[PDB]
Amino acid sequence: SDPVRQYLHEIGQV
Amino acid sequence: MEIKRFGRIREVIPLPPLTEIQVESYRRALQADVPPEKRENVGIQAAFRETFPIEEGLVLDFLEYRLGEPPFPQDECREKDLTYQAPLYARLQLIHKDTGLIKEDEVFLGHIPLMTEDGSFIINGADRVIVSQIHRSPGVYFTPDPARPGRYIASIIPLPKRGPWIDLEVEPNGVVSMKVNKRKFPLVLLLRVLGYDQETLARELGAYGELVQGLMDESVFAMRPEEALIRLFTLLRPGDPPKRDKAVAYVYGLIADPRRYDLGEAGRYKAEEKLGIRLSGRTLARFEDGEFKDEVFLPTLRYLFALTAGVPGHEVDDIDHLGNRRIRTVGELMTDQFRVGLARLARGVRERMLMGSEDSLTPAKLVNSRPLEAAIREFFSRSQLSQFKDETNPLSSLRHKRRISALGPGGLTRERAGFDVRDVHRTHYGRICPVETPEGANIGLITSLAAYARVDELGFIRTPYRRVVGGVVTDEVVYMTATEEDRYTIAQANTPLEGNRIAAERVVARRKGEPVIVSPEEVEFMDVSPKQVFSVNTNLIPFLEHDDANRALMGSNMQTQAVPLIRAQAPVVMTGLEERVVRDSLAALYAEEDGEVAKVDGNRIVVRYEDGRLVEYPLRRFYRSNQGTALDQRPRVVVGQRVRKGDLLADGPASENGFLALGQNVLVAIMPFDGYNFEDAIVISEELLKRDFYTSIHIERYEIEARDTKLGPERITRDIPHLSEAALRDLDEEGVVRIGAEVKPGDILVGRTSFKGESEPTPEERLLRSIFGEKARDVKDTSLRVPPGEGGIVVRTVRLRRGDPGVELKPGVREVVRVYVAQKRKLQVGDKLANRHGNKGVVAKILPVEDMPHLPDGTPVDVILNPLGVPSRMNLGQILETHLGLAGYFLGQRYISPIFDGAKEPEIKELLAQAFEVYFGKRKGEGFGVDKREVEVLRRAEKLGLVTPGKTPEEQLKELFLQGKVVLYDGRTGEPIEGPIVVGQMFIMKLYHMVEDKMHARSTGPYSLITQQPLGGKAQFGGQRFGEMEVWALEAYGAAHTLQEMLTLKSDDIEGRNAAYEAIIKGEDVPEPSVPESFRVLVKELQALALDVQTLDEKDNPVDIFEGLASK
Amino acid sequence: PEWMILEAVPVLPPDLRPMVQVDGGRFATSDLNDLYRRLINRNNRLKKLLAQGAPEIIIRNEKRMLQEAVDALLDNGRRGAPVTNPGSDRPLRSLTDILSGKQGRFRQNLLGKRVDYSGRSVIVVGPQLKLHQCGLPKRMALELFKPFLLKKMEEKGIAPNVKAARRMLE
Amino acid sequence: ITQGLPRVIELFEARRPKAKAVISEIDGVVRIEETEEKLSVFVESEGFSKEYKLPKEARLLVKDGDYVEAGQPLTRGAIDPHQLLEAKGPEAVERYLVEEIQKV
Amino acid sequence: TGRGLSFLDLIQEGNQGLIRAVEKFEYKRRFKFSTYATWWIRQAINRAIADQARTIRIPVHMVETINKLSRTARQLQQELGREPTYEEIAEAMGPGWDAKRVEETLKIAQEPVSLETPIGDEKDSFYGDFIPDEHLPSPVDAATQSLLSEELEKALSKLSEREAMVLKLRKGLIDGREHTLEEVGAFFGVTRERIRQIENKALRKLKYHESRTRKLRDFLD
Amino acid sequence: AXXXXXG
Amino acid sequence: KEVRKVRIALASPEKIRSWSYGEVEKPETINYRTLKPERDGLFDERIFGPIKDYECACGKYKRQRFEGKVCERCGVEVTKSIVRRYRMGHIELATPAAHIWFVKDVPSKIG
Amino acid sequence: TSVYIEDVLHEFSTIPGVKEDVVEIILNLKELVVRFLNPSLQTVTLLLKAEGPKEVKARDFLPVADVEIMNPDLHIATLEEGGRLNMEVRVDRGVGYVPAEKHGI
DNA sequence: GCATCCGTGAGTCGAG
DNA sequence: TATAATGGGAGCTGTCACGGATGC
Ligand SMILES: [Mg+2]
Ligand SMILES: [Zn+2]
């Protein structure tokens, strides 16, 4: 939904 | 002349200062007169205190602020297009925690707009008004659930932009739900976050059996405040890591953080009074000693359950009640935007604090004032509540400042606005005028503050009443809110009094708005005046009680639109309010103390007071207002005249000897006239123009700039290519038209030349050039000319240049020149006239005096009003006004007839009798008896039952005159009107709607860029819109060619319109239409959406409307 | 069906999304330019990130942003937050916005238009007029009939030619 | 007491009213059955019978034991044009819409 | 943020910076990666801000000059208690800077405004609706050029075929280009002196006829 | 403000 | 021929490219100093056509005599400036992108 | 039919030392009744020169042959110390009502 | 079979 | 071009009635 949140999640993966 | 006033009601208190709602608000917000240490926690000081301290280790703190003097006075700001403002300095100190180093400095934050003496602002040279907003007061409300009866909603509402609305509802599944940011979750969870044990919630909510059981969830109580907090955080923030400090941060910011969440002081008070509790802070909870503590939530839940159960002393709320609706005035709105800009400045501060060098950082380096400046400027420019001030007449300004709007930021939108909020609530009594509102889309949304009404410190509108003890009416006056007013039985202001005691066996009163007949023992309070029920405008309508409300609305609204007349007069029948309006509006100039007049001039009045000091008052002379009406002050005193305190020194616009003058007093006959007064049209006498009645001065401002370009500079000069000396006749050496010259459409106000756009002359131009042997000039005539339909005398020129002292323009501009042109406007056909009772009409005919109906003594009437306008409209006030107007015509006197305490028929009849003696006995002494025509008319009236048979002609004529009717002679024949006609003096105004401003026509002119359709509007020389419905009309007529012309030849068909113009100047019939350009625009815009639109023939083969130009 | 996916995003002719110098020499322009610029910036950055062998998270983010850019261009505010210009809450006006609504191309410029040879003024009762007649102010008529008037002025000695007549009526 | 513009719009949009009257889907004879607590109206043909359960406070346009046409209103209120369409056919609906709009 | 680029854009450009830092890193220096990365990241973000943020693109050095002018003016206003004049800014900028340079620098720095900018409190008025099209000729201008061409033909028809054609060639009515004397002379098969002479007499007869009928006068504005 | 032109 | 019917249909990438007179490779609009359009920008005269009638950007061919001619120096076709409201450009995407009309319009046609 | 006042460029102006503005001065001059004796005489320019403090009346106009002011008590202006008024007022024969706009004299 | 979500509509000139 | 620095930040809350797509 929120692109920034999504990206911060994908970053939070590694 | 003598002023006779009617009515028995003695007003205990005068009207409060009418601009106070603006003035005291802004003064309270700024606190400029208060020494910094004595300032309160309200206003811009509040915003400073909320923003600071700024932490995260550097810490920026706020000591105090100060406002300097304005760099320029108001007038100079108006001329130079500046903003009247004061420099705002803030003393700040940076403290490094570890080092202990403290650097202290006073930083310049830019400017803040100062409110003028009359409660307005000057923004970029133009006067503006910040309109008060009305909204739902913050607090805790309980409203019926529209779907399920028996269930209710508990809404917790903070101030706008102060954090989220919170809803509490008992769900069909039995559990209590909380809604925040559109998230439904069980309330018990948050209850656990606040640290509530099941035992406490059980003993508290146990009194209500079924509900508290639905509150009980063991999975929640099996948790800890930490675990519950993190659970709630995971519920409100999916995907966001549930760190402890982050959850604490979020929940604190959502509920307990005073900076993020703010109930107003009013929200605080109302919550306290409703829930029967005491609030510590303005938030719903606190963070204390490491954990959270509840404030509002439990009392709210308790009340909600109590209301659901039916427990006494619990009611729903009327959200339209004026106890639940408050006002945000100038101070609050400005303070709000100040808070926002300050917050941004703070963000910047934390940025610089992190990035900057740790050894040396001053507050000056940390603070960028720009965002704050931007916020303030934005508020005073682009806000919906910041409106162009209406200066048309002084009453317009005064009324504008007293406006209340439900619209704007944090307010309603006209879509969300239904009948309920637009209704007149019973609680509007004494607070918001039931009468004056717009007729159209804004009806009920834009309202007016009642005359005696006041806005308290909490923002609630309060109206005055008077204490009544034991049937005795005191002089003690008490201002209550609607909530307080609901607690009492309040008698009407007209209840008969002998001394201070009420004498009636039965009195008419209100209890919670409900009309009730009570004994004097039951009367707690009594109204101050009928005036308090209405607005300042509505209070200017005499015989208001005789006018239907719908037309009172129109009269009210239209008084605002009255144009100041050079000869302007106060009404023959006034309401008694005419002077206070002039005084409060700061229109007139008054004497400061008792004294003697030293000097009297057109430009100046010098007064010597008791102090022996010589005080000089400059008079504003032929100044242009926002609406182009001329505002000028004329001296009403003379040299050597002694003046006491509060005496009138000078009349401003629309003021006759200190009385509000919105129009003329004219002699009207109410009769049909040859269809010229058909459907509200009005017939006037040329005699009105002869004596300059309804003549008004209007000043228009024209402006031109000469700037640096890449093709060479534009320049303001008298040297204009291809122009004769006839055209430059009135131009001065520098190229500017000279003061005193008369300008007409097409005339040059300011000469200007601009270097030509680069072009290779077409072979036609080259050949013509060689033929006439004249070199093509490299500059062209850009000069500013008088637009069509305008003109006048040039009264002013302003010339500002780059390189001139005290003058710096916007980049690239070499010079700016303004030309002020004044015009004297006589009344003409199509001009709008109106009275205070809602009778409006456009002048359809101006007859020479000999054609006018006249009295037997040879006196012609001024105006002919059609009687057909009366019955359906039901405004009889104008008739009474006319009748009394007749009396005062012959007695030579003016009247004050207060609203609802009035002049009554019998009194008017007495005055009419005296007047009749004046009007007749004179004739009888002059040696003339009754006329034959008068005899015939008397026979007619005798058949109508107007006069009694057997009486003498004089007796009967008097009988008619007491009915306000007189014999009237047709000027064209000499034979009398068959019936006697109502004739008398009426107060009529010339409204701001003038055909001279509205008349527009165009053949061809500028076209739009993309659509290639004509521009809109008179100022742009635009074409009229032929819209979907006009198209429907042409379709319905089956007129295909007229329509096709509208769609093509006359608008966006380029080739078509060109060929049409040429065809017409040639005398050929117009060529066949082509494709309208906007269809091509449609095709290409659909192509940009990746849709292929193809025009095809009957062979289904593509047709190119772009004629190969779009295809490779 | 695959044409419902865009490999190549079309670009509107510039005159339909003008960059124009207004009276004061300052520039005014359509939002479509800003939308297109977002699009081109993100696309170019995508090509450079590809050519340079960027990690998958980065390329994913870039592609997502590219799709959202295209969305903003074609229909703005249709999915997700509407794209706004810096320092303003005003949504940018996309092609969909241009087409539809009361202010849209169809209703504003197509089913209705502003027209030439038109005027307006206040009305006044005509009682002397015959049913088929209306009073028309002289000057309004002079403007509305203007080309005809030039022609008729040339038909007589009133002016040497059309241009002379017009310069005379100026 | 007029329904006015919203009624006109209700008809032109062919909207299912919330004031909706209950109509018979077929022909038959009316047998009313009313418990003090609950009320119902049955329409009985020779071949088969149908049941209409409605709130007990509803105004009935029917007398017990009466023969009603298909689509004929059992209760007061505006008719659902689509129900009237499935029941009595297109002409009936045309007549209904026209007369109804004209009433206002 | 707030500098003209979206958060995600700043992030992506910063990622480009991160890539540069990765390819340029030396572990031998024993410095942690974040130190060397941060430099290139800030570099890429700032380059992006300078390059993309304007509808009308400005060179990075010029953007630096403009921002410097801004900071200068802001400090000057911070100590002056008011916005500075061009002269004061010029003083604070140093040698090479006068009032005119500051003024023009501020001029070229001006960003465009939206055509869709709303006008009035309603939603029905765009700022672009007030802007006329100066490019496309008006019906009046078109008709005037038409009558001009027709009249020029009328006047040229009072000459002979040759002199009218010479004039049309030299003035560019034929192919649009203006031929030299040698071209019209080689075309009609005469000397350039001769063709110049017949051009002269053509123009002369046109002058006489024009003084006579006063027909082409009004097209001279 | 609309209706028949009060404002 | 007379216009009879009007068809509307999906446009293929090939069709879209057939429409385009050039690809816009740069976000640039006009040059800050010159106020002329920038090469490969949204306003480029090379793509969308001449700003002045029958005159190229560099000013090598200023006259109508050249028609359809393209300047070697500035790459600008000499023709009527009107074409600037007609000729489409295009942008070639690295990753294909869905047209939101066929996604967000329910029920989704792609879906 | 016309009024000239020294150091006054138009009707919209005020004069130092004079209470009335020019609009009012003209409004007063519009009440002026001027009788002509000789029927042959079409126009007369009445010259006025005055200074204050005084109240300038219609009587203060410099006399002309065969010209009688029928209302000498008619007020014209109020002049103050230092206030100076110099006027030339053109009075014509005529019929009916002809507005300033029409004759432009 | 039926609650609830989301998207989309909500008057015309005039001026601003 | 090198100390080290490693998940953001506002929401905006008083219409409404419909139609059509998902969910018990
Ligand atoms: Mg210097
Ligand atoms: Zn070229």
Side-chain angles (χ1 to χ4, degrees), chain E residues 137-214:
Chain E
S138 70
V140 175
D141 294 346
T144 277
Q145 261 288 343
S146 188
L147 300 186
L148 174 65
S149 286
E150 293 182 341
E151 271 296 333
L152 276 174
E153 188 55 39
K154 285 172 178 288
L156 284 173
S157 72
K158 301 314 182 66
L159 307 180
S160 61
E161 293 280 333
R162 179 167 71 179
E163 48 192 6
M165 188 54 183
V166 164
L167 247 46
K168 286 181 181 178
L169 283 171
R170 295 279 284 102
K171 300 306 170 50
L173 270 93
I174 303 305
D175 54 7
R177 85 179 180 101
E178 301 185 353
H179 298 69
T180 62
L181 289 179
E182 305 82 26
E183 298 180 0
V184 195
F187 175 70
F188 276 108
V190 294
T191 317
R192 54 178 306 278
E193 162 77 353
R194 183 68 199 287
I195 210 85
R196 194 258 301 187
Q197 222 78 44
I198 68 183
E199 177 182 38
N200 281 330
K201 66 163 183 168
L203 187 59
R204 195 147 46 205
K205 290 174 187 175
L206 280 188
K207 286 185 177 183
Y208 183 84
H209 298 335
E210 166 55 32
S211 72
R212 172 180 175 178
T213 67
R214 313 172 109 93

Side-chain angles (χ1 to χ4, degrees), chain B residues 268-311:
Chain B
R268 189 174 180 270
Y269 166 75
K270 278 201 68 272
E272 285 176 359
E273 212 70 17
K274 179 67 173 179
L275 293 180
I277 64 177
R278 188 69 168 98
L279 243 307
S280 172
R282 295 200 291 233
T283 60
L284 311 184
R286 300 169 305 178
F287 186 89
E288 180 172 327
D289 305 322
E291 61 177 24
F292 292 115
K293 260 285 97 183
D294 182 30
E295 295 272 14
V296 180
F297 283 94
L298 184 63
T300 296
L301 180 53
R302 191 269 316 153
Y303 196 109
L304 173 61
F305 281 179
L307 176 63
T308 316
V311 184

Side-chain angles (χ1 to χ4, degrees), chain B residues 586-859:
Chain B
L586 292 180
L589 217 163
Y590 296 105
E592 177 174 341
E593 211 78 27
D594 301 82
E596 188 188 37
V597 170
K599 301 176 76 175
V600 163
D601 199 19
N603 313 319
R604 145 268 292 172
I605 303 185
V606 185
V607 186
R608 173 173 301 281
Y609 295 113
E610 301 279 49
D611 327 329
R613 57 189 176 105
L614 216 50
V615 182
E616 179 168 337
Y617 299 103
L619 302 178
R620 174 171 305 108
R621 276 302 191 159
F622 304 100
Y623 270 58
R624 173 194 136 90
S625 71
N626 277 347
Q627 283 62 49
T629 50
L631 311 182
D632 76 325
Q633 306 170 293
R634 290 90 95 248
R636 288 300 169 251
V637 299
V638 285
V639 186
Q641 175 172 341
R642 297 182 190 176
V643 288
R644 289 166 167 86
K645 192 186 184 58
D647 268 20
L648 175 73
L649 290 176
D651 268 332
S655 183
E656 181 195 39
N657 300 321
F659 295 84
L660 183 69
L662 287 188
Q664 310 281 16
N665 298 289
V666 284
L667 191 65
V668 303
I670 305 181
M671 49 176 304
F673 201 84
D674 285 332
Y676 289 102
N677 51 7
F678 176 79
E679 293 280 54
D680 298 334
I682 302 183
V683 176
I684 72 170
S685 184
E686 191 178 37
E687 210 65 23
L688 293 183
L689 303 195
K690 289 174 183 178
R691 66 186 196 263
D692 259 316
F693 268 39
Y694 302 113
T695 298
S696 56
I697 303 174
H698 298 259
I699 309 162
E700 185 61 270
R701 164 183 152 178
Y702 302 85
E703 187 180 25
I704 193 179
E705 292 181 356
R707 69 167 194 95
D708 275 329
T709 80
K710 303 191 169 303
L711 280 61
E714 300 179 326
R715 59 210 183 282
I716 290 164
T717 172
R718 196 188 183 279
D719 188 339
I720 307 176
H722 306 11
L723 275 258
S724 73
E725 297 295 334
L728 309 182
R729 175 174 68 104
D730 295 320
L731 295 191
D732 78 341
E733 180 195 3
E734 299 184 1
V736 180
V737 71
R738 55 104 191 174
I739 294 192
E742 182 191 2
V743 293
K744 295 176 181 179
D747 289 355
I748 301 178
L749 298 170
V750 175
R752 188 187 65 180
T753 60
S754 294
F755 286 91
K756 295 188 170 183
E758 49 180 286
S759 298
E760 298 282 63
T762 62
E764 281 78 3
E765 301 169 12
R766 176 57 191 178
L767 177 56
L768 198 63
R769 204 93 287 177
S770 299
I771 291 178
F772 286 91
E774 296 297 300
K775 278 290 185 178
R777 295 203 62 187
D778 46 337
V779 282
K780 59 178 178 184
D781 169 33
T782 49
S783 308
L784 165 63
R785 302 175 173 265
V786 176
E790 301 181 357
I793 307 307
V794 179
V795 298
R796 281 195 68 178
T797 59
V798 182
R799 176 156 177 160
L800 305 180
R801 281 166 287 190
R802 177 172 62 190
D804 285 11
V807 180
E808 176 175 293
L809 300 324
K810 56 189 175 188
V813 174
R814 306 183 56 91
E815 45 184 342
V816 180
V817 171
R818 305 185 225 279
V819 171
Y820 292 80
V821 179
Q823 57 183 194
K824 213 167 56 177
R825 294 188 177 182
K826 290 262 188 53
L827 191 61
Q828 62 166 340
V829 176
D831 276 331
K832 196 178 185 176
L833 298 186
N835 65 25
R836 297 165 291 178
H837 309 274
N839 193 338
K840 46 176 159 60
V842 124
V843 167
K845 190 76 173 176
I846 304 178
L847 310 169
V849 64
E850 72 265 22
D851 282 38
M852 217 68 42
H854 54 92
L855 307 174
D857 73 329
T859 296

Side-chain angles (χ1 to χ4, degrees), chain G residues 56-61 71-76:
Chain G
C56 60
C58 66
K60 187 155 188 171
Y61 317 91
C71 171
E72 311 85 37
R73 197 177 308 171
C74 58
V76 174

